[PDB]
Amino acid sequence: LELDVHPVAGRIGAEIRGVKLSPDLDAATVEAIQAALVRHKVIFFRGQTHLDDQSQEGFAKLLGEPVAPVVDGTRYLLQLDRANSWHTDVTFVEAYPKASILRSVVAPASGGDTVWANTAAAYQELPEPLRELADKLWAVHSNRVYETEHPVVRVHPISGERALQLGHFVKRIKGYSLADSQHLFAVLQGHVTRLENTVRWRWEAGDVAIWDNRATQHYAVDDYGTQPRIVRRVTLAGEVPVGVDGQLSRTTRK
Ligand SMILES: O=C(O)CCC(=O)C(=O)O
Numbered sequence: 001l002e003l004d005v006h007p008v009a010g011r012i013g014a015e016i017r018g019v020k021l022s023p024d025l026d027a028a029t030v031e032a033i034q035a036a037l038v039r040h041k042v043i044f045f046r047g048q049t050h051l052d053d054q055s056q057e058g059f060a061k062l063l064g065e066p067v068a069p070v071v072d073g074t075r076y077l078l079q080l081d082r083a084n085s086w087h088t089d090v091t092f093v094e095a096y097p098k099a100s101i102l103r104s105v106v107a108p109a110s111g112g113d114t115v116w117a118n119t120a121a122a123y124q125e126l127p128e129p130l131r132e133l134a135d136k137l138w139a140v141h142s143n144r145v146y147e148t149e150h151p152v153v154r155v156h157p158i159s160g161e162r163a164l165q166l167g168h169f170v171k172r173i174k175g176y177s178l179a180d181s182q183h184l185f186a187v188l189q190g191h192v193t194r195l196e197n198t199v200r201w202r203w204e205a206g207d208v209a210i211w212d213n214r215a216t217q218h219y220a221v222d223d224y225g226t227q228p229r230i231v232r233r234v235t236l237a238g239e240v241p242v243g244v245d246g247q248l249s250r251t252t253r254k
């Protein structure tokens with residue numbers, strides 16, 4: 001099964017046309033969506049104006065297990081109405097989400113974009129000696145309580161692609177002074193956010209984005225002032241990250 005797939009930037013992002021998201025999608029469609037998700041890291045569906053809270057949740061169950069103050073009439077749907085900092089979702093926990101499904105309900109006429117970065121492409125572009133170092137690093141992620149140690153490089157459980165696991169929740173690279181930690185983090189994270197590794201989406205009401213949280217970071221642009229912006233999100237449960245040597249992440253505090 002071949003979806004009508006339209007890449008947005010050169011290294012990340014694709015719009016999928018001809019698909020009406022719902023709880024009733026067949027297996028071939030769901031599988032093709034999951035494949036496009038892994039390949040493109042963030043995928044976009046426009047004109048999903050029939051989708052409401054319950055059907056967004058029902059659609060989400062087809063891709064994984066939703067995780068649990070929620071939108072009335074639902075168990076897992078959350079409203080956001082700001083995250084202008086580069087991050088991978090909830091990495092201060094051990095088994096953080098594998099994906100989110102985010103729908104635009106009210107969209108600013110100007111501003112309000114979201115940007116995603118491909119952390120697998122960011123890893124791949126490092127010179128070999130720098131990949132080898134990144135393969136050995138561990139970082140402490142925190143919500144400063146919750147603290148988790150994750151490998152800086154995560155091997156994706158479906159594709160096997162290696163991806164940098166960094167972003168806003170990183171407190172420090174384990175085993176380094178603060179000064180060295182800052183420099184090493186600035187190098188690796190700088191590759192994540194390099195423009196070539198990103199795609200910026202301008203939202204219209206009824207757009208839905210789905211991203212693979214295991215191989216992305218994102219950033220919500222806070223340039224829209226008091227213009228109302230309302231989005232609704234379902235988050236899907238993910239796995240404990242595995243590093244390049246097979247070691248697993250571990251919570252070290254609370
Ligand atoms: O509004 C968005 O595009 C995403 C918001 C977000 O990333 C968050 O709350 O963690």
Ligand code: NA
Nearest residue numbers: 083087088089
């Ligand atoms: Na987020």
